[PDB]
């Protein structure tokens, strides 16, 4: 205790310079490893004991109701320093860190799963080679696969581009799958107590944190999307989006949202600001699905504000449906909020997207 | 002589299978190294001796009127096997081979240019470090630079992608420049006879063959460009280009040629054929300027045939003006040829391009 | 001719410092590649034509009566500068150079020996894999083996110690065979 207190009196650190989005993103990893990593599964164990005791049933293993997300390196609202480059970086770092923590979990499992009794199905999944140490086989495979993607990300973090390894991890299913295979045979074969221990903790961290460790949220003001699209439209000679009435903008946006011909000029020369808007949707599009939780529009005032980001994301080439969220943060915006959403819900195109 | 004849009687080789564009491209490199390499400069020496003797003047060193080009791996007219991939490859191989032959030239120069007397200008160009062996300095630099790009291309040829070296050679000026520097000081400093020997031979091979060794020509039928563009237009819901009258197609082509908004769908799914047409313009665009001599349109029948390839090249993102050539190869096309070109020359847009 | 003479008038080199045993050893490699390399075999061809013409028989292929040796980097008599280190080096360099010249010979052979007819014994020696291009097989093998030892010696010359490759060449029998 004395040692620890002396530490803090003498271990003085004072930032001399403004922290950076990466620094802030790093503090969030500190919170994840020093507390959330143990905390979520314990929360899930207690919660589960209580359901059975009081209600008579336990949630199924596949149901993990908690998820942690971060805005660190995702929120650019009013922050010049959070550029598309930094987001790209932070996106990368999270994956590096999930590999770090996932490795510790798997080491433990590689040594503790010395069981040799497996189900037809599980033996099938390995069949020979590792059929004399089945659960250890699957954990050994994943360790390598994790070690591979780890190695890849430290290169990328360094600025080195190099083809990605055979077993690069991008999705939680790639982690979940094998882990769940062990659980099932362990349960099936009478090793329930081993299944429900460290593996269960890892199964739940997979869905709670997974591959990205902590999904990020992107957030930019509505105003900046308008400027990007105005600049685009004047360059194309189509007109000036930031002057059109709101009925016109929706018209323009629904037209283009349904259009099969592209709009974003192949090799263009926009202003810094606009490029940032364009680059960030490119990072979104580029990132593995499930890395980004949502696109938040601070200062959302009209139906065109939401349709705008959908247009940009489409131009950035995005394969999945990205949840966009208006952020009403004024008395009148709050007051108009329900009107803004019923109009949005009335557009059939929006409704189905 | 007996040895050599026996060789051919017994050294029997018979292709068992159809040669490939690369094979044919290789035979062309054999012709270049076994005969053109010595032949062009000798031709240029004789030609120059004759001008001075009979007319009283010699052409200037910078004027090399001969250039060799190949269609091998460039001509796809009627040849399925000459795909955009093969062209990309052959394009690469030529550069590998020019590095091979250029290295032999430079070795000779690195050892023979032991002169130490240089001009202010030439010493300036090195200044210290290699200022005690100036011409040897510049040749030593180029040797490395050639050896660097050589190394790079053998990787690419192998299918390995890796950032390109500091001094990668892409243009003839990169070779010409230093070589010409030596010539000037050698002349200036009284070493005329050394200048006009092996260096002069290398100077002329630079412009005659240069970096690409032998520029290629691309050639596809007009008919295939029509199909690519028809397919595109029906996908976009604009109509069907291969049904429109010729006045309409020109209208469509001049419209799009002036358009700042792109046309080629970001991530599209065309037919094999169309993709080949699209991929090849991508190779053209991707290749260093001066690798491709011209785009030949076999079966050119109307003004829209030429405007078509310009449209496609624009969609493929091309920074320079690529010479397109109609190939009239029928009695009626021949007969209509002058009509076809006066209409083309009457379009102001075409005239200025 | 004019070019060549001008070369020598203007290509002036004058050692400023005493040459070293390696330099002298290098001049000897220049003599070997610019003249002995072609010279010995021509001498052996002429000599052989003459035996058959005048005496009626030719020496057997295995009999090569000439051998060249050097004292460069071997003679320390009165020469401090020719230390055990230099000899070690020169010993190494010679092997590097024999690999250089032997490679040129083998390239030629790898391309010119396109024959497919071989003896039981020769096919046996390859048996399958390269049994559809037999002489080319054996030359291809040796090229690699030479390229391997070449690579090894340039490392050693550089001062790098690293285990020696599978097919390192050390004896003439390895080439002869």
Curated annotation (Swiss-Prot), chains A, B:
Keywords attached to this entry:
Allosteric enzyme, Carbon dioxide fixation, Lyase, Magnesium
An annotated GO BP: tricarboxylic acid cycle
Q: According to its record, what are the GO cellular component terms?
A: cytosol
The UniProt record lists the keyword Magnesium: yes
Q: Any signal peptide, and if so, which residues?
A: none
Annotated TM spans = none
Q: Which domain of life is it from?
A: Bacteria
The keyword Lyase belongs to this UniProt entry's keyword annotation: yes
The terms under GO molecular function for this entry are: identical protein binding; magnesium ion binding; phosphoenolpyruvate carboxylase activity
Q: What does this protein do?
A: Forms oxaloacetate, a four-carbon dicarboxylic acid source for the tricarboxylic acid cycle.
Subunit organization = Homotetramer.
**Of which family is this protein a member?**
Belongs to the PEPCase type 1 family.
The protein, known as? Phosphoenolpyruvate carboxylase
What gene name is listed for this protein?
ppc
């Amino acid at each position: 205790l004395r040692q620890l207190i002396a530490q803090s009196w003498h271990t003085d650190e004072i930032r001399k310079l403004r922290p950076s989005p990466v620094d802030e993103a790093k503090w969030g990893f500190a919170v994840v490893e020093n507390s959330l990593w143990q905390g979520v599964p314990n929360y899930l164990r207690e919660l589960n004991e209580q359901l059975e005791e009081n209600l008579g049933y336990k949630l199924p293993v596949e149901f993990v109701p908690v998820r942690f997300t971060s805005w660190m390196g995702g929120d650019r609202d009013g922050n010049p320093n959070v550029t598309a480059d930094i987001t790209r970086h932070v996106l990368l770092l999270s994956r590096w860190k999930a590999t770090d923590l996932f490795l510790k979990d798997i080491q433990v499992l590689v040594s503790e799963l010395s069981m040799v009794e497996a189900t037809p199905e599980l033996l099938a999944l390995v069949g020979e080679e590792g059929a004399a140490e089945p659960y250890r086989y699957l954990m050994k495979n994943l360790r390598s696969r994790l070690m591979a993607t780890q190695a890849w990300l430290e290169a990328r973090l360094k600025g080195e581009e190099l083809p990605k390894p055979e077993g690069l991890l991008t999705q939680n299913e790639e982690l979940w799958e094998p882990l769940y295979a062990c659980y099932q045979s362990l349960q099936a074969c009478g090793m329930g107590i081993i299944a429900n221990g460290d593996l269960l903790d890892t199964l739940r961290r997979v869905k709670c944190f997974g591959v990205p460790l902590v999904r990020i949220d992107i957030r930019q003001e509505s105003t900046r999307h308008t400027e990007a699209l105005g600049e685009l439209t004047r360059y194309l000679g189509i007109g000036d989006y930031e002057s059109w009435s709101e009925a016109d903008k929706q018209a323009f946006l629904i037209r283009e949202l349904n259009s099969k011909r592209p709009l974003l000029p192949r090799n263009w020369q926009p202003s810094a600001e606009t490029r940032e808007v364009l680059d960030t949707c490119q990072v979104i599009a580029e990132a593995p699905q499930g890395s980004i939780a949502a696109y938040v529009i601070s200062m959302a005032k009209t139906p065109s504000d939401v349709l705008a980001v959908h247009l940009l994301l489409k131009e950035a080439g995005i394969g999945f449906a990205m949840p966009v969220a208006p952020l009403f943060e004024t008395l009148d915006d709050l007051n108009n909020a329900n009107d803004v959403m019923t109009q949005l819900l009335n557009i059939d195109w929006y409704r189905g997207l």
